Design a protein. Structure first.
Lengths: 276, 281
């Protein structure tokens, strides 16, 4: 039966689907809980500042403010943004798919080029990213040969030390790829420590909201900085790929276990009930 | 020779690196050529419009205008419509919008129109993304397999009816053509048509929207379901479904293009090698 495996397949898809739907619903209610408040407080104090500027500058007629805001809002759909260095940064947001959005094409032909550039660029960057991941793979692999030698000539031995190696990968990786660059970002951009870590995670997972962008204010920057950020992008993307990938394996495991716990729970509940 | 393959490896990485640098430079100069002009023309006519209300209201402190615009622009990120003729509004963080938000996180499309402002919305977003992205990847994998089989069935029937006086490797060419063509109709063209009519976007803006969304670049300059229009609410559901299946399809296509570049790379390596060896007799 070719249909029988395909039924077992669709069974699995359907259950992961519903778990994802469930993940979205829980997420939606937690986000709403956290943000609908601030949205209300930001809306009332925008309405305050509106009236407080009609009166504290009486020269402005109420009708011309509405025209001023239209001109501002219209020009937000535009804003130099497109110098060589910025347009290079733009190209990086395309091929990495971080896609921050602070800058994006407005011209019919900038958009047509972006389509072509992305379709060829994303796969090309993927090869680089793969190569870079392999390099980091070996460098870390050397380092865990040396720490599965020195810590396997004394204390508690095989299979529990798999757990220790992965902890060192997360801890050293978070220092090198999250913490250290967050420290720099805090000092150089003037972001809070939380905003910087948020920035790191939103950028390296490639979510890339664009609410924060390193090198993105009109600050003066030492031009070692952007280069170093580029390098961090290259290596941070590989590291987050690996980590995201690890978490996937953890969910695969935890899924096996929850299936067995439900099965235990059934087997025992049953021969409790049969015994009656 | 564990070091020998690793040396050959680093050699290849270094060359792809430089090709990528080169790809970025060419890209940068083409984008600049295409955008820097309009940006200059838009900046001079913004400075024009500035003067017509800078000096037609001199009693406004005018350094304080710059502070007013900062407050407006800052509050556009939240998404205020600070008008008296439209002072009553919908919320950006109602359940359906905050559900959409969660989708932009786990897919990593991350459009950015909406994004947490609270210290704790940000802390949740970090946790939510680290667990969510891997979870969605399993779904996306499963969905890809489904489409895999459904198309595989369809090419059993079209590699049967095309059994005329045909080989094992040349019919791979026909299958891939039908995959691009049918896929572009179902996952790019058709939804662009709908998007054009429902959102009022140009046909180009819609296709741009499709490609920027399904590659997961997700600039956020365009977002289906993003205006305060009307919307039938068959619509967003259908868009959700298109996201799910469009992401799987673009994954596959992006993956194919990668193979084509792997091919063309073998060939250019041999052409350069020929060109070297012969060197005009
Ligand atoms: C640490 C910070 C604290 C935060 C809280 C932290 C909370 C914990 C962290 C994250 C949330 C949890 C995420 C992981 C999901 C856990 C739920 C259960 C695992 C799962 O997901 O559903 C599984 C098992 O469900 C069940 O029995 C029913 C139970 C479902 C509900 C259980 C509880 C989950 C709901 C509550 C928690 C999650 C909600 C979200 C939490 C929100 C936090 C923000 C089914 O699907 P299945 O794919 O496993 O099916 C097999 C298998 O998989 C095989 O191996 C083959 O293949 P394959 O899948 O390996 O490829 C397949 O195919 P075949 O053999 O049929 O051909 C097939 O046999
Ligand atoms: C309609 C629109 C069309 C517009 C026209 C646009 C037309 C062009 C279209 C798109 C962009 C360019 C396509 C042409 C190919 C470019 C890549 C150059 C080939 C290359 O790489 O060097 C080759 C051999 O070259 C040389 O001797 C040096 C010559 C390099 C410079 C030659 C021209 C390329 C750069 C300039 C022209 C293109 C620039 C981009 C133009 C922008 C257009 C928007 C050896 O390969 P290798 O040692 O580097 O390593 C391989 C390889 O890298 C493989 O392909 C995997 O990666 P990958 O590079 O393909 O991504 C790895 O896989 P693995 O074995 O590691 O697992 C590994 O096998
Ligand atoms: C918005 S802007 O008009 O001010 N222009 C710029 C913004 C950022 C940068 C820059 O290079 N940032 C480092 C960087 C590099 C590559 C990638 Cl993918 C991401 C990042 Cl964060 C340059 C110009
Ligand atoms: C303008 S708004 O920010 O105020 N609110 C909303 C904006 C958009 C949507 C929506 O459902 N779009 C379909 C959709 C679904 C999931 C994903 Cl991942 C991407 C997309 Cl395009 C809903 C609310
Ligand atoms: C609105 C009702 C439409 C019902 C469509 C049929 C639903 O069944 C499922 O359709 C999948 C897609 O082809 C199959 O692959 C699954 O094996 C099958 O269980
Ligand atoms: C590891 C932390 C590294 C942070 C280095 C911080 C140095 O601050 C520098 O202060 C200068 C004022 O004298 C500014 O003009 C420079 O733009 C700025 O870079
Ligand atoms: C004169 C020496 C050749 C210089 C040509 C410039 C390009 O770099 C070389 O391209 C090769 C592909 O053929 C790589 O895979 C090599 O490792 C690398 O050295
Ligand atoms: C199927 C072949 C695809 C195109 C590859 C042609 C290779 O020839 C030339 O190689 C040079 C490198 O030394 C480049 O400088 C030229 O730009 C390039 O045209
Ligand atoms: C409607 C306006 C269309 C503008 C066309 C934009 C296409 C520009 C493509 C530039 C091609 C780069 C050639 C380099 C290939 C080696
Ligand atoms: C020498 C072996 C490879 C070294 C790997 C990089 C280590 C440095 C950590 C990353 C430093 C950049 C962080 C600051 C980015 C703004
Ligand atoms: C009505 C507007 C016409 C523009 C629509 C886009 C057509 C060109 C898209 C690019 C197709 C070539 C893809 C190249 C694959 C590497
Ligand atoms: C890995 C070392 C950095 C490679 C990228 C160099 C480009 C720097 C351009 C900085 C800028 O955006 O002006
Ligand atoms: C991944 C599948 C989730 C689709 C659930 C349908 C919800 C659509 C929301 C419609 C609305 O917010 O008005
Ligand atoms: C100033 C400290 C910021 C706190 C950042 C914590 C991020 C969440 C930790 C849990 C990771 C899954
Ligand atoms: C054959 C079943 C449906 C095929 C895919 C439909 C997705 C396109 C809908 C686009 C909505 C904007
Ligand atoms: C007039 C519309 C023509 C549609 C072309 C769509 C091309 C999609 C390219 C994705 C591989
Ligand atoms: C200031 C409160 C931050 C903690 C929020 C935790 C959400 C799970
Ligand atoms: C297996 C070869 C497929 C042919 C690719 C080119 C079709 C445009
Ligand atoms: C193919 C598994 C997906 C986890 C990110
Ligand atoms: K990706
Ligand atoms: K992405
Ligand atoms: K993105
Ligand atoms: K964005
Ligand atoms: K945006
Ligand atoms: K994005």
């Amino acid at each position: 039966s070719d249909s029988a495996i395909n039924v077992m397949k669709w069974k699995t898809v359907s259950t992961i689907f519903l778990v994802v739907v469930l993940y979205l619903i829980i997420g939606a209610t937690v986000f709403k809980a956290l943000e609908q408040p601030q949205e209300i407080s930001q809306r009332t104090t925008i309405v305050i500042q509106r009236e407080k500027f009609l009166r504290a500058h009486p020269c402005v007629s109420d009708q011309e403010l509405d025209e001023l805001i239209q001109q501002i809002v219209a020009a937000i759909n535009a804003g130099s943004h497109w110098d060589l260095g910025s347009s290079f940064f733009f190209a990086g947001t395309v091929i990495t798919t971080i896609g921050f959005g602070n800058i994006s094409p407005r011209t019919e032909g900038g958009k047509i080029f972006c389509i072509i550039y992305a379709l060829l660029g994303i796969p090309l960057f993927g090869f680089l990213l793969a190569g870079v991941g392999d390099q980091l793979g070996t460098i870390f692999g050397k380092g865990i040969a040396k720490v599965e030698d020195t810590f396997i000539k004394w204390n508690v031995s095989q299979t529990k030390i798999r757990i220790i190696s992965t902890i060192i990968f997360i801890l050293f990786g978070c220092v090198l790829f999250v913490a250290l660059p967050a420290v720099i970002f805090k000092h150089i951009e003037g972001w809070s420590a939380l905003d910087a870590i948020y920035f790191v995670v939103i950028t390296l997972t490639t979510i890339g909201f664009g609410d924060y962008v390193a090198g993105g204010s009109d600050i003066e920057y030492l031009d070692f900085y952007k280069p170093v950020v580029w390098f961090w992008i290259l290596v941070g993307l590989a590291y987050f790929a690996a980590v995201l990938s690890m978490i996937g394996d953890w969910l695969r495991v935890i899924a096996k276990k929850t299936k067995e716990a439900v099965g235990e729970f059934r087997a025992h509940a049953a021969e409790w009930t049969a015994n009656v």
